[PDB]
Paper text:
Using a phylogenomics-based approach and complementary structural techniques, we identify a family of dimeric hemoproteins comprising a domain of unknown function DUF2470. The heme iron is axially coordinated by two zinc-bound histidine residues, forming a distinct two-fold symmetric zinc-histidine-iron-histidine-zinc site. Together with structure-guided in vitro and in vivo experiments, we further demonstrate the existence of a functional link between heme binding by Dri1 (Domain related to iron 1, formerly ssr1698) and post-translational regulation of succinate dehydrogenase in the cyanobacterium Synechocystis, suggesting an iron-dependent regulatory link between photosynthesis and respiration. Given the ubiquity of proteins containing homologous domains and connections to heme metabolism across eukaryotes and prokaryotes, we propose that DRI (Domain Related to Iron; formerly DUF2470) functions at the molecular level as a heme-dependent regulatory domain. We heterologously expressed and purified the recombinant protein encoded by the Synechocystis gene dri1 (formerly known as ssr1698) and tested the heme-binding ability of this small, soluble protein (96 amino acids, 10 kDa).
His21Ala exhibits a shifted binding interface with a rotated heme ring (~34°) relative to WT Dri1. Calculated Polder OMIT maps with the heme, His residues, and bulk solvent excluded in addition to higher ligand B-factors reflect a loosely bound heme. The loss of His21, and presumably zinc binding, prevents axial ligation to the heme iron by His79. Instead, Asp20 seems most likely to be the side chain interacting with the heme iron, though the distance between the carboxyl functional group and iron is long (~4 Å Fe - O distance). This coordination distance can explain the increased heme rotation and mobility observed in MD simulations, resulting in a weaker bonding interaction and lower heme-binding ability. The His21Ala structure further suggests that zinc ions could bind via tetragonal ligation by His16, Asp20, Glu76, and His79 residues. However, since the Asp side chain can only have one binding interaction (as opposed to the two nitrogen sites in imidazole), zinc-binding might prevent Asp20 from interacting with the heme iron. Such a hypothesis is in line with the abrogation of heme binding by the addition of excess zinc to His21Ala. We observed that all variants with a single amino acid substitution retained heme binding to some extent. Both His21Ala and His21Ala-His79Ala variants displayed a red-shifted Soret peak at 415 nm, which corresponds to a reduced heme iron or a modified heme coordination.
Numbering used by the authors:
A (entry chain B): 2 to 95
B (entry chain A): 2 to 103
The structure:
Amino acid sequence: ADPLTPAISDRICKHMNEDAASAIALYAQVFGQQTDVTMAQMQAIDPTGMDLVVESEGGSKTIRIEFEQPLKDSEDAHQVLIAMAKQARSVGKN
Amino acid sequence: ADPLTPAISDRICKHMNEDAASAIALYAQVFGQQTDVTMAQMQAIDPTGMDLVVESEGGSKTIRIEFEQPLKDSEDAHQVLIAMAKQARSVGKNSAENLYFQ
Ligand code: HEB
């Protein structure tokens, strides 16, 4: 139940970039409305949103995705990210 | 750098059964040599191995997967589990098919 400190953010991003690099690209494609996503890495996460580095058509744009509900702790972030991954996977397969 | 205590095992297994249920089935399929796995849940994890409950059309079999290298801490476990999931996915991409001739 750790608060979303910058130290926690770097930890979440570090692990998210290696374990769920697939989900990060889906975030950029579905919620970030990015086409032709090659790679996507998480740069930061805070209570109100997350920042993604999206590689596309030989170009590295950084986008920001705002959570509808503000996050309070690490567990809150965990639950939103898992749900967003499911929502993204459903839309991508269709 | 948390040691792999029984309390840590319960936490890892809980999260792995929630966010990684797909990868635990690949563990049963690839490393556990189980064919036609319906569901697979992780029951326990310790430095020398992990215990899986594998359901295969009403089988509910408990198998044990022994790690090549003993785990040292929770970070080591984290790394090992990810590589095993990637490896399991890779072998799955090299698909096998019964072969028949014209
Ligand atoms: C933040 C919070 C968190 C935490 C603490 C964690 C922790 C963890 N984890 Fe995690 N994960 C996560 C969040 C997380 N996580 C996510 C979000 C994901 C995603 C899922 C998907 O992909 O969708 C994962 C995912 C995951 C997976 C899957 C991947 C693949 O692809 O296969 C695995 C195996 C893991 C492991 C793990 C471990 C061992 C641990 C302990 C250290 N993970």
